[PDB]
Structure 1
């Protein structure tokens, strides 16, 4: 009761420091494996940072949805911060898009002056990338249905909406792995191959992050964590998943509808 302001109070935590050290171990493992072919430090880095990010968010869920310090002004700031992270990732991706556009708008002389460079056979965008767009757009409209069913208050329908959007996202990920197994060349093969393989796999890293966020929000909703209006976890999930929808749409139209 000594705290008079309605803002947030933090008991000091070790977990920012341990997450920072885990990132340091991650990058040390990256250089140790990229130069001296050792995997032990890299596996240590993955174990450290994944566990640390787990109990960091486990602490924030404890201190938010059972203790109750998350004032409406606090999730107002949380949606500020999530919007800031979203637009930072917009400009991250847009830097990647503009790198692709600089590579593709002016084809260099060794590529034959044509996009794509000759001699390679990029996959047709006609069937399975339309499948990718269909499955991701269906997942997005399903999670909008999930948000409106949060508004309505129908638990089993929220359950099926989440189950179908995780099913769709995992189907997306396993199939894009399948045509990674079913593509004519590799990331080390040319400027065009390198850019779309890196961009699409990097989007794949974001969509597995988004799918794991959907896993964890499902297991919260099974534990009756989210309520009628204080549902910012699913708001962040919806914003991130609509983000990866529109980013996938941009890289789709660019890579596939442009020069194929």
Structure 2
């Protein structure tokens, strides 16, 4: 029963891969779109992106440790690792929201240029994906605390593992293409 659900979620992640590839192509076309506005070199702070990448990688490692603990049939360890993963994700979302607020207040919002619009679209899509993952972690933890480690809970944890690692891979592609390559 778990097999079919995990395979379905894998096919959904492949659909989401197509979804993100379309946004990547859109950004690549509109990378030079900006006219009389900020460019990649002018606004991209590399230390901030490095801190974001390390915190999301810490999130991925902590969630992996949660999956190992769930294989070890321990509840407290899974709860603690999920809490640490959610805290790392919340930190990452906080930094993304701060960056967006700083860009918008400084009159560099998505309404300024094609390049800024595409940048906002891609990073925002990743942000909503990560916040959906965070809400999923919140509901999964509150379900574990009151139901324990059941077959349904194990299936949900495997699906969330696939989702979170997929998001980390997408963020690797994002910082490679958008942030790091732009600031070159």
TM-score (norm 2): 0.88
Q: Which residue of 2 aligns with 1:201?
A: 124
> Does 2:150 match 1:223?
no
CA contact (8 A) 1:220 1:226 kept: no
Give the total of aligned pairs: 179
3-state SS in 2 of match to 1:258: helix
Q: How many angstroms apart in 1 are the aligned matches of 2:143 and 2:172?
A: 30
Q: How many angstroms apart in 1 are the aligned matches of 2:182 and 2:82?
A: 36
Residue 229 (structure 1) shift? 9.2
For structure 1, the 5+ residue unaligned runs are 1-73
Residue 167 (structure 1) shift? 0.9
TM-score (norm 1): 0.64
Structure 2 counterparts to residues 1-260 of structure 1, below 5 A: 74-104=1-31, 107=32, 111=35, 116=39, 121-125=42-46, 127-183=47-103, 184=106, 185-227=108-150, 231-260=154-183
3-state SS in 1 of match to 2:30: helix
Give RMSD over aligned pairs. Answer: 2.2
CA contact (8 A) 2:57 2:168 kept: yes
Judged with a 3 Å threshold, the aligned counterparts in structure 2 of structure 1 residues 90 and 83 are, in CA distance, closer, same or farther, namely same
Residue 102 (structure 1) shift? 2.5
For structure 2, the 5+ residue unaligned runs are none
Q: How many angstroms apart in 2 are the aligned matches of 1:136 and 1:224?
A: 28
